[PDB]
């Protein structure tokens, strides 16, 4: 049921509208830090050096560097909001 | 126990959100 | 063979399409 619990989380996350809000906020925030443009320019330039450019391939070279570049403000705000949602949904 | 559950669930959801965000940049970038 | 490769890839994609279609009915149904 471990994989079935994740379905219930994702289920309620989307239906309650929290998925929309968080994905929207996270876009707006990452966009203002210039984190979008920084990650965008890296993927674009990563695409030009290598002829065959597969997503899972460039994911491994861009993802780890991109996580840390997330401003601490943004990362903590989102993590908080996620946990607050989880805290209400998970049972005692 | 329950505390450890939410801790991982949080990180996994946070990662999904960002993973998706990357994907949209990848796809939008190839345009 | 290459014939067997596409055979599985076909079914998996067909399933994905229908799996998604179900999901959308599920989510739309809870409305």
């Amino acid at each position: 049921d471990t994989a079935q619990l994740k379905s219930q989380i994702q289920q309620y996350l989307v239906e309650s509208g929290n998925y929309e809000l968080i994905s929207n906020e996270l876009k707006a925030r990452l966009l203002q830090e210039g984190w979008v443009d920084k990650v965008k320019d890296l993927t674009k330039s990563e695409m030009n050096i290598n002829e065959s450019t597969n997503f899972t391939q460039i994911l491994s070279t861009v993802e780890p560097k991109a996580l840390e570049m997330v401003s601490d403000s943004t990362r903590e705000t989102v993590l908080k909001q996620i946990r607050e949602f989880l805290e209400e949904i998970v049972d005692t | 126990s329950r505390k450890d559950f939410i801790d991982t669930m949080t990180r996994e959801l946070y990662d999904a959100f960002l993973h998706e965000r990357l994907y949209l940049i990848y796809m939008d970038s190839r345009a | 063979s290459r014939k067997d490769f596409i055979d599985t890839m076909t079914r998996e994609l067909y399933d994905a399409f229908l799996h998604e279609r179900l999901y959308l009915i599920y989510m739309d149904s809870r409305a």
Binding site: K6, Q10 | E20 | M27, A31
Partner: peptide
């Protein structure tokens, strides 16, 4: 604005 926002295939919470 009328229907619910579904995550894209990129949202890989499950698997």
């Amino acid at each position: 604005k009328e229907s619910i926002v579904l995550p894209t295939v990129g949202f890989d919470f499950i698997k």
